[PDB]
Swiss-Prot record, chains A, E:
GO molecular function, a single term: ATP binding
Species name: Saccharomyces cerevisiae (strain ATCC 204508 / S288c)
Modified residues (Phosphoserine): S109
Protein name: V-type proton ATPase subunit B
Sequence similarity: Belongs to the ATPase alpha/beta chains family.
Protein's membrane topology: Peripheral membrane protein
GO aspect biological process, one term: proteasome storage granule assembly
PROSITE patterns listed in its UniProt record: ATPASE_ALPHA_BETA
Main location: membrane
Binding positions for ATP per the UniProt entry: R353
From Swiss-Prot, chain B:
Protein's recorded name: V-type proton ATPase subunit D
Subcellular location field: Vacuole membrane
Similarity-based family: Belongs to the V-ATPase D subunit family.
Residues of the full protein shown: 155 to 205 of 256
Other comment: Present with 8500 molecules/cell in log phase SD medium.
SS bonds (residue pairs): none
Function noted in UniProt: Subunit of the V1 complex of vacuolar(H+)-ATPase (V-ATPase), a multisubunit enzyme composed of a peripheral complex (V1) that hydrolyzes ATP and a membrane integral complex (V0) that translocates protons. V-ATPase is responsible for acidifying and maintaining the pH of intracellular compartments.
Subunit organization: V-ATPase is a heteromultimeric enzyme composed of a peripheral catalytic V1 complex (components A to H) attached to an integral membrane V0 proton pore complex (components: a, c, c', c'', d, e, f and VOA1). Interacts with RAV1 and RAV2 components of the RAVE complex, which are essential for the stability and assembly of V-ATPase.
Curated annotation (Swiss-Prot), chain C:
Modified residues (Phosphothreonine): T107
GO molecular function, one term: ATP binding
Outcome of substituting C260S: Reduces splicing reaction speed. Inhibits splicing
Record carries keyword Cytoplasm: no
Reaction it catalyzes: ATP + H2O + 4 H(+)(in) = ADP + phosphate + 5 H(+)(out)
The record's account of how the chain is modified after translation: This protein undergoes a protein self splicing that involves a post-translational excision of the VDE intervening region (intein) followed by peptide ligation.
Function: Catalytic subunit of the V1 complex of vacuolar(H+)-ATPase (V-ATPase), a multisubunit enzyme composed of a peripheral complex (V1) that hydrolyzes ATP and a membrane integral complex (V0) that translocates protons. V-ATPase is responsible for acidifying and maintaining the pH of intracellular compartments. PI-SceI is an endonuclease that can cleave at a site present in a VMA1 allele that lacks the derived endonuclease segment of the open reading frame; cleavage at this site only occurs during meiosis and initiates 'homing', a genetic event that converts a VMA1 allele lacking VDE into one that contains it.
Organism this protein belongs to: Saccharomyces cerevisiae (strain ATCC 204508 / S288c)
Note: Present with 199895 molecules/cell in log phase SD medium.
Protein name in the entry: V-type proton ATPase catalytic subunit A
Domain of life: Eukaryota
KW Hydrolase (keyword) present: yes
A matching Pfam family: Hom_end_hint
Length: 457, 51, 593, 174, 457, 182
């Protein structure tokens, strides 16, 4: 009927239960403009929905409501790459149609995209510590960890600048010999950071093969949280339809987690501990549910989200809740960025349980897992001896602590220092890790087998 | 040996006095405010759910 | 009959639902969605749907089917991967064209197009039967019958019609029993609710050991079959490799894989890694996949499938233990089921008292561990069975002292350690040697003291050496390395060889990843005899570098005992450790001088 | 509670009647007279459940399951020794010796019956081969020695034939 | 009338408020299964009752409930020993009835039979360090603090199993001439842990003089919380009615605190910091109010509660709040259990407020209170001498630190380690303390009187 | 006065409040349990029960004590042990023979068997009285008297009845104040 009330950003309207769950509705205002909204929850002759554009402008007793009769679905096609689009529908380079040949849901109910096997195709992003220490492949879910106070937008601009040149380095390794596509989804990002991220992809030469989804910070949280489902549905539809490799970068997860806290403030549900709701694991599981290898045994859709720690730790609900759905993450240190390093990713708080399944034959080696454990043990020994060396001094430290301290300084300024346009190979990263690991004796190395360590010594 | 022990005792007393003087207060003062902030953050979610 | 009250998230609330228990399954809406009414608040009932809702309108009719929501138990559980609601993903992958079924469809609990060989048990015409008795048998393995057809609980009577031997499907009747009038029709499969656990005559303590193929896990505590153990992780420790090595190194008659929630790659890694593994008792066509029953539930599905996945895995684990065979249940993880129950409590809008969790999470978590364990087999035969429950834990509230670890540590009996930072440093599978306890060490060590050497004294001395090594490491780090006596160097050298021999592991089972209890006790006996010989030689006058350099090939052969498999000995112990025990005594006199 | 005791009494009476039909075992039928008395005459299950619910019949599920486990172990040990026949006095002395022990999950009789039942179950669905023929001949000689000497007297030939039968059963076809 | 609804562990019933508080109610189902419960909250035209076994399977329009009309009471008698019962007073061994001669409700000792008086008789439990270093008297509360690193259930079952044999050895020493009883209560224990305490109590011989209450973790928290008032009322009925010294072991306090924090903390009340509400001190004070000296001058109720920490943390309000009510405490270390000591409890961090003055005389010598200062000073000096020997080396260790270092291993390997079927006394503990203190000379013992040191070396 | 509407946990809810203040103590039900009205929400008042609520059902009357929750001050406080609620510990030690007060106690806060000798002060008939002036003296110690009989607060008027010297109990009156009638 009319708008019954409004509590925060969401409005509570009294209508009939003829509309389905998540069905699109059109609110008719008396100002001469119609607005679209999504039904967040249904009730007993009551409905709680949020407006897609704006929050003010509706009436109280003179408002009019109407049902569209169609659920929320974005038309996906094969011509979405190259053009510039928006999350809510702001056309700046788009026309009347989006070139959508099929109708797919934004939740992945009838699709169910997920891999039923371990990833064999190795994918590299141009980082020696990320590719060598993590060993990520196609269909893996590993998010990037950030911090509050450090340049997370510069690390996301460097990771976005590295996306596009990984195909020529991966083609020589024999890990990727197919088409490559990039799915860019932005929500709650600045215009200068989105212009620099689009300028990095335009300078790299991946503007025609990449799609851009722009979402503003002053818009509603339903459009910013709804844009990654449409971008993941377009990347899953393009990657599943042609058997191509699609890489999806979702930035930022803190804007979606902060936008999810504003929602549910006028419904029956309530928030949980620390301001975030207790059902946020299903909301992050809905976006992460469309990640993995596609059905067909050809191609896959990889997901690499960018999350920033608001408290500089993993005890928060945003990195702790998102880290539980994944199987590890990469920790970026601000201490390495303060002294000067690009990227300042550390190897102490980083571990992946899919490094053995990702490494195969013909595109990787067998000593990379032992060299990563030996480099993580030497970096943990040097980082552990570096904190104890400040308190007591250099009078009670042995040669083993000085070897790990020299290995941490030698490997800290060599492996962590790299360019933003050059992509290092996995064999050059393992050969550079063997030179940094070749500072100690052969008897002092026990994180590898003796047969493989004696051959590659 | 007397000249070695007289040189070692001045380093040992300064190291023990520096570590014992610098050890406890930052961790205790941080742990008390972390426990109070965890108590208030644990109390606010129960207050909103009770409301 | 019913009306759709309100739909918020993956759980739907329907009003006008009166006269229904907490176990009857019904269809929500006009699409016939699979669901079950767990609880009710006033005139509206809360029913958790296993499928997603994105096209369900308010006001749809919801009528109960008139029976309890249960899964089908019988022939067809082994050699197939299922979901948390008894749904075949293999047939739904080729038939449905997706890993998950669409909304509004329902799949059967088992395949009905496969035929099995029916064998008559100890029951015939005129003999009395009851629940739990073995009325039939099926072929679930290539060596012997591992899946016996048993009657459902709460049923009994006299067999009036018994089918003969031959091949029959799951849709034809092969048994008929009527106690009072007409009882019911019998088939190859059986119906039973997953929310109610299977009963038992009596529970007994574990007195039988069960090897898991872990050097540090069997060396730190004695492995038994029928106990409870917890593993602390962070989703990055590498628990899938320990589950694959534990499943490959296990020699039990049945395997139970229960996954409450994962990312998706862990379920495909167990299914793809299951056919590559081989059984330790006999080789067959897919022995690792056909010998165990795996239930894989993802974290992208609703909370009803993840909550019912632990009940279906507990019912499938109790069903194999009710027949009388030894089953090993590997569950990972309980933090996803507790987080799903906390997400259901947050979706319901109830006030919590556990820092954001429901009050019924501790009762369901403590009650879930009581379903597994060794006890008397239910039924007229009274066979002996056991079920080992290994459930990995993880943090779910942002701290290391949440209620899941508190209730799991109090409800459990074995304490196992796990370090992600130590596992990343090439130390997997790592365990905590300072914080751990077990009650079956005396009972398992009682038969191991008579049928084997004194492993229990070497376990306490090995735990004391690792406890003293952590105390000597702080004095060696703070005060200095060349400031300690020669007595702590033998304990640190024995602790480095014990930690490198037991904690040191490579891959799942590659490079000699198997280790028996007798080989672990014989390997630890050479380290304890070498440490006692070095401590006794250093007390009678001897240099530290003269004794450490005087050891030589003894420390290299003792440290290199992780690559010698059990083929060198007869079946359990290695003869090189027995000759190395006399070689350490012969080298002890040369090491002193 | 009473249905499990009535089912254990009916399974004990049916197992006792199927074990010895001649009734020449006064030792096994002597202790089970209270259960065979309500199984040797015409009666319904409701009368046995109502008689056990009123404290008139045996209602101990632990003692009925413990005696039913020894009766099932004696029936499985007697059935696994085929086609060799043992003496009735040796079977009554073995059942009287196994009945005198309360623990039936750590004793050597359950390990010997499980060891013979594993070789008989593995040899029931086996294939004709040289290892299956040698393991079948050693299992037949171990079945003859188990039928001649029983399961109460410890012998080195039964332990060596059981260890060689388990080692031959654990071996593959290569 | 009928069951209105079910939300979590609590069930809503539409019955009238004619029944009183603590009135037992029976739920009649249409499947032939009758369940009993206790009325937790009663209102007008509504009632809140908790199911004792199960919370699912009750109809909302087909299942009815009725009121029996009898309040919650446990039959207390002298024939309850030597039998296994449940958490509500029902026998689970299939034997006879309770056979109680009096009806007394368990609500916190409403009769007021206890009196505030200082203790005057010594109480022992079969431990040398527990009876000597932190020995409690009749009516003194002494809790055992542990964590999740040692067998606290086997130590709590061994403490009750060790009690009962000190009465004949003390009676041979001309000590007490009255009969002694034991009270055993289990809450949240497993089936193997419950059968292990019955097998250890039957093997030790204290099962005939003690009563066993079995409470499992699969049942509700109302039976586990109802079992401690029934065990305390059963021990208080024999201690007050018979005038005999009865020792009660209440394990575990972590399951009672988790059951109290889990249920009955979200209906109309709010919790405190870390989920532990402020009403737990009154709940533990209700069980602590039924312990102490009784009227008659010949019997008392000894309370030995078992408290297990989750991870050995001191930031929880249960150990700090529970430690203020008790007069002392016994701390157990996890390092002693890893070395091979049974039990792993140490008397280094344990202390008692009234140990020598609280205990009486007749079975204990006067030098037992003076030998504990020399033994605790020798163990405390040997604990620092153990690290001082590794710190200083082999040429800077004093003879006093070496004698205390050998006395720490000799006293630790003989005074704290014992079997599971052995028994100890005050004379054997004093002779073992004199034998352990006899290694030191007469010039190094100055923490005792010269008459007791010259009389006994 | 009020009717018992519901009893959930250790707190009791009673409706029908027609003037019951939030500082007066009363006994709920027929057991005479200790309690006081902490808050009130509409017609139903919230009262906290500090004793065992076993045996309490809906539909019971609530009898107010007629004054706020306080303690009695008079002779006999010395040489006696009591609680904070003014409970007789010597009366419980004489009747019940224990040191803990039982549930449902309704005795007075002072003993009435120990009589004291009351002596008149300097106040006479005709002169006005007020709270604070020493109206008399009563022995409270074992040898001498230290408890001075003074006028209570919130009272003033003329001494209409002057009781003479002699031995009297605490229940019997010895003085009467006349101000605005009775």
């Amino acid at each position: 009927n009319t708008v019954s009330g409004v509590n925060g950003p969401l409005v509570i309207l009294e209508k009939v239960k003829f509309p389905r769950y998540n069905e699109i509705v059109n609110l008719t205002l008396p100002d001469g403009t119609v607005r679209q909204g999504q039904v967040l929850e249904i009730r007993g002759d009551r409905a709680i929905v949020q407006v897609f554009e704006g929050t003010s402008g509706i009436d109280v007793k003179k408002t009019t409501v109407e049902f569209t009769g169609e659920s929320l679905r974005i038309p996906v096609s094969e011509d979405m790459l190259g053009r510039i689009f928006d999350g809510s529908g702001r056309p700046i380079d788009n026309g009347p149609k989006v070139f959508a040949e099929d109708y797919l849901d934004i939740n992945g109910s009838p699709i169910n995209p997920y891999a039923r096997i371990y990833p064999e195709e190795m994918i590299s992003t141009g980082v020696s510590a990320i590719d060598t220490m993590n060993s990520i492949a196609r269909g893996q879910k590993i998010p990037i960890f950030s911090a509050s106070g450090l340049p997370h937008n510069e690390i996301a601009a460097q990771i976005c600048r590295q996306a596009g040149l990984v195909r020529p380095t991966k083609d020589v390794h024999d890990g990727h010999e197919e088409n490559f596509s990039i799915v860019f989804a932005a929500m709650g990002v600045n215009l200068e950071t989105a212009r620099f991220f689009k300028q990095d992809f335009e300078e790299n030469g991946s503007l025609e093969r990449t799609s851009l989804f722009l979402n503003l910070a002053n818009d509603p949280t339903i459009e910013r949280i709804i844009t990654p489902r449409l971008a993941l549905t377009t990347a899953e539809y393009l990657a599943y339809q042609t058997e191509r490799h699609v890489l999806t970068i979702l930035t930022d997860m803190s804007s979606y987690a902060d936008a999810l806290r504003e929602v549910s403030a006028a419904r029956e549900e309530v928030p949980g501990r620390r301001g975030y709701p207790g059902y946020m694991y299903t909301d992050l599981s809905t976006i992460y549910e469309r990640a993995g290898r596609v059905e067909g045994r050809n191609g896959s859709i990889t997901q690499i989200p960018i999350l920033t720690m608001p408290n500089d730790d993993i005890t928060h609900p945003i990195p702790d809740l998102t880290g539980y759905i994944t199987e590890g993450q990469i920790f970026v240190d601000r201490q390495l960025h303060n002294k000067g390093i690009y990227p300042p990713i550390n190897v102490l708080p980083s571990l992946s349980r899919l490094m053995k399944s990702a490494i195969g034959e013909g595109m990787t080696r067998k000593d990379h897992g032992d060299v990563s454990n030996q480099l993580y043990a030497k970096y943990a020994i040097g980082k552990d001896a570096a904190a104890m060396k400040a308190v007591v001094g250099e009078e009670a430290l042995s040669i083993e602590d000085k070897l790990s301290l020299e290995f941490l300084e030698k490997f800290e300024k060599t492996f962590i220092t790299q360019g933003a346009y050059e992509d290092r190979t996995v064999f050059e990263s393992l050969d550079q890790a063997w030179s940094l690991l070749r500072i100690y004796p052969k008897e002092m190395l026990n994180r590898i087998s003796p047969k493989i360590l004696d051959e590659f010594y | 040996a007397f000249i070695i022990l007289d040189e070692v005792i001045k380093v040992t007393n300064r190291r023990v006095n520096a570590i014992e003087h610098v050890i406890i207060p930052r961790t205790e003062n941080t742990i008390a405010y972390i426990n109070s902030e965890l108590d208030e953050l644990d109390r606010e979610e129960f207050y909103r759910l009770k409301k | 009959y019913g009306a759709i009250y309100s739909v918020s998230g993956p759980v739907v609330i329907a009003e006008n639902m009166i006269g229904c228990a907490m176990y009857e399954l019904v269809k929500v809406g006009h699409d016939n969605l699979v669901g079950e009414v767990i609880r009710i608040d006033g005139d509206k009932a809360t029913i958790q749907v296993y499928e997603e809702t994105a096209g369900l309108t308010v006001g749809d009719p919801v009528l109960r089917t008139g029976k309890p929501l249960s899964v089908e138990l019988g022939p067809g559980l082994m050699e197939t991967i299922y979901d948390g609601i008894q749904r075949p993903l293999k047939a739904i992958k080729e038939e449905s064209q997706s890993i998950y079924i669409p909304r509004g469809i329902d799949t059967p609990a088992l395949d009905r197009t496969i035929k099995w060989q029916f064998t008559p048990g100890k029951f015939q015409v005129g003999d009395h039967i009851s629940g739990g008795d073995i009325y039939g048998s099926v072929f679930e393995n290539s060596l012997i019958s591992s899946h016996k057809i048993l009657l459902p609980p709460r049923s009994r009577g006299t067999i009036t019609w018994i089918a003969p031997a031959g091949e029959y499907t799951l849709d034809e009747k092969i048994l008929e029993v009527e106690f009072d009038g007409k009882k019911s029709d019998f088939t190859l499969y059986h119906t039973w609710p997953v929310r109610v656990p299977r009963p038992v005559t009596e529970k007994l303590s574990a007195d039988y050991p069960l090897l898991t193929g872990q050097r540090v896990l069997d060396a730190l505590f004695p492995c038994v079959q029928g106990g409870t153990t917890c593993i602390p992780g962070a989703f990055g420790c590498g628990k899938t490799v320990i589950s694959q090595s534990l499943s490959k190194y296990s020699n039990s008659d049945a395997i139970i894989y229960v996954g409450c929630g994962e990312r998706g790659n862990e379920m495909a890694e167990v299914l793809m890694e299951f056919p590559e593994l081989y059984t330790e008792m006999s080789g067959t066509k897919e022995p690792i996949m056909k010998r165990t029953t795996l239930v894989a539930n993802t974290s992208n599905m609703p909370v009803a499938a993840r909550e019912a996945s632990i009940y279906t895995g507990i019912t499938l684990a109790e069903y194999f233990r009710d027949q009388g065979k030894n089953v090993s249940m590997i569950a990972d993880s309980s933090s996803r089921w507790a987080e799903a129950l906390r997400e259901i409590s947050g979706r319901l809008g109830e006030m919590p008292a556990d820092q954001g969790f429901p009050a019924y999470l501790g009762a369901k978590l403590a009650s879930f561990y009581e379903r597994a364990g060794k006890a008397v087999a239910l039924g007229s035969p009274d066979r002996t069975g056991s079920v080992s429950i290994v459930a990995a834990v993880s943090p779910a509230g942002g701290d290391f002292s949440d209620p899941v670890t508190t209730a799991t540590l109090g409800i459990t009996q074995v304490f196992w350690g796990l370090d992600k930072k130590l596992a990343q440093r090439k130390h997997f599978p790592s365990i905590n040697t300072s914080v751990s306890y077990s009650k079956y060490t005396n009972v398992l060590n009682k038969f191991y003291d008579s049928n084997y050497p004194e492993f229990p004294v070497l376990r306490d001395r090995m735990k004391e050496i690792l406890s003293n090594a952590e105390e000597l490491e702080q004095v060696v780090q703070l005060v200095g390395k060349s400031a300690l006596s020669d007595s702590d160097k033998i304990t640190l050298d024995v602790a480095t060889l014990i930690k490198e021999d037991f904690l040191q592991q490579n891959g799942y089972s590659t490079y000699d990843a198997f280790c028996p209890i007798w080989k672990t006790f014989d390997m630890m006996r050479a380290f304890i005899s070498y440490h006692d010989e070095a401590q006794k030689a250093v007390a009678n006058g001897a240099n530290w570098s003269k004794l450490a350099d005087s050891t030589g090939d003894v420390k290299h052969a003792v440290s290199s005992s992780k690559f010698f498999e059990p083929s060198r000995g007869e079946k359990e112990v290695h003869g090189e450790f027995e000759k190395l025990l006399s070689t350490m005594q012969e080298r002890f006199a040369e090491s002193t001088d | 509670y009473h249905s499990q005791v009535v089912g254990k009494i009916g399974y004990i009476a049916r197992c006792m009647q199927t074990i010895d039909p001649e009734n020449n075992l006064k030792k096994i039928r002597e202790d089970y007279q209270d259960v065979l008395i309500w199984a040797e005459k015409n009666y319904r299950f409701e009368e046995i459940l109502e008689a056990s619910k009123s404290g008139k019949c045996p209602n101990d599920l632990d003692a009925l399951s413990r005696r039913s486990l020894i009766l099932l172990e004696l029936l499985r040990l007697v059935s696994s020794i085929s086609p060799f026949k043992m003496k009735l006095d040796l079977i009554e002395s073995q059942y009287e010796k196994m009945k005198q022990h309360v623990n039936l999950w750590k004793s050597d009789y359950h390990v010997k019956l499980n060891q013979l039942n594993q070789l008989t179950d593995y040899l029931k669905n086996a294939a004709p081969t040289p290892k299956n023929n040698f393991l079948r001949a050693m299992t037949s000689v171990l079945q003859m020695q188990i039928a001649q000497y029983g399961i109460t007297e410890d012998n080195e030939g039964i332990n060596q034939l059981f260890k060689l039968g388990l080692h031959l059963l654990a071996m593959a076809n290569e």
